[PDB]
Structures are given as structure tokens and as C-alpha cells.
Curated annotation (Swiss-Prot):
Protein's organism: Homo sapiens (Human)
The protein's name in its UniProt record: Bromodomain adjacent to zinc finger domain protein 2B
Span of the entire protein shown here: 2054 to 2166 of 2168
Subunit structure, interactors included: Component of the BRF-1 ISWI chromatin remodeling complex, at least composed of SMARCA1 and BAZ2B, which regulates the spacing of histone octamers on the DNA template to facilitate access to DNA. Within the BRF-1 ISWI chromatin remodeling complex interacts with SMARCA1; the interaction is direct. Component of the BRF-5 ISWI chromatin remodeling complex, at least composed of SMARCA5/SNF2H and BAZ2B, which regulates the spacing of histone octamers on the DNA template to facilitate access to DNA.
Tissue: Expressed at varying levels in several tissues, whereas a smaller transcript was expressed specifically in testis.
Domain of life the protein comes from: Eukaryota
Bromo domain sequence ranges: 9-113
Gene that encodes the chain: BAZ2B
Localization: Nucleus
Role: Regulatory subunit of the ATP-dependent BRF-1 and BRF-5 ISWI chromatin remodeling complexes, which form ordered nucleosome arrays on chromatin and facilitate access to DNA during DNA-templated processes such as DNA replication, transcription, and repair. Both complexes regulate the spacing of nucleosomes along the chromatin and have the ability to slide mononucleosomes to the center of a DNA template. The BRF-1 ISWI chromatin remodeling complex has a lower ATP hydrolysis rate than the BRF-5 ISWI chromatin remodeling complex.
Family named by the database record: Belongs to the WAL family.
Length: 115
């Protein structure tokens, strides 16, 4: 409350560390469905169904331009990429499996780096 604070967690490395995680996600062999925005002119149904499209290149640009206020808003966009994937793709598809694999990869790096 006013003039009453928990000890200050060092967040000075968070930007660099989120960048490193995102590089590892970018170079994973199953990243290909997520590298670029889904093409809303060429993929019937995507625009209407997926209210907030997200992809790794859009996260990279947001990260590089100071549009993440904190490390949690960064995690929320990464998770949005995988939630969107599950919304649109059957589990038994190459893309569906890719999304599960990448979400697991991310959540481990996230826990090991920050928890």
C-alpha cells in the first residue's frame, strides 16, 4: 500500500532474456506455422474467427520497440499465438501438433528463466 512495498525484484535483464527465449522459439524446427502473420486474404474464416491474431514476427517487432510494459504482457502474446492455433487447427494435424510442441517448449524456458 502507500509507503509499504515488497522487496524490489531485479527486472533489468527481462528485456534481454525475453529476446533470447523468442530467438529460441524462432529457430525451433516446428516454428514455421507461427513465423509470420496468417494471411487474412487467403485463409477463409481466420479474420472473423480469430479476434486477436498474433505471430512471432509481430511479437519481435513489439519487443524491439518497447511495446511490452513488463515480462507478463510478453508471455500473454506468446500464449495467444498457441491459443489461436488451437482455436483454428485440429489437434491431429501438422499445425495442431506444432502448436502443442511449441507451447511446451515455451513454458519450460519460461519457468527455467524466471521461476
Amino acid at each position: 500500500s502507500m509507503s509499504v512495498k515488497k522487496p524490489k525484484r531485479d527486472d533489468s535483464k527481462d528485456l534481454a532474456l525475453c529476446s533470447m527465449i523468442l530467438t529460441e522459439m524462432e529457430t525451433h524446427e516446428d516454428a514455421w506455422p507461427f513465423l509470420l502473420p496468417v494471411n487474412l486474404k487467403l485463409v477463409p474464416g481466420y479474420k472473423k474467427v480469430i479476434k486477436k491474431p498474433m505471430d512471432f514476427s509481430t511479437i519481435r517487432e513489439k519487443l524491439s520497440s518497447g511495446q511490452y510494459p513488463n515480462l507478463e504482457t510478453f508471455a500473454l502474446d506468446v500464449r495467444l499465438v498457441f491459443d489461436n492455433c488451437e482455436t483454428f487447427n485440429e489437434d491431429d494435424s501438422d499445425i495442431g501438433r506444432a502448436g502443442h510442441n511449441m507451447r511446451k517448449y515455451f513454458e519450460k524456458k519460461w519457468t527455467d528463466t524466471f521461476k
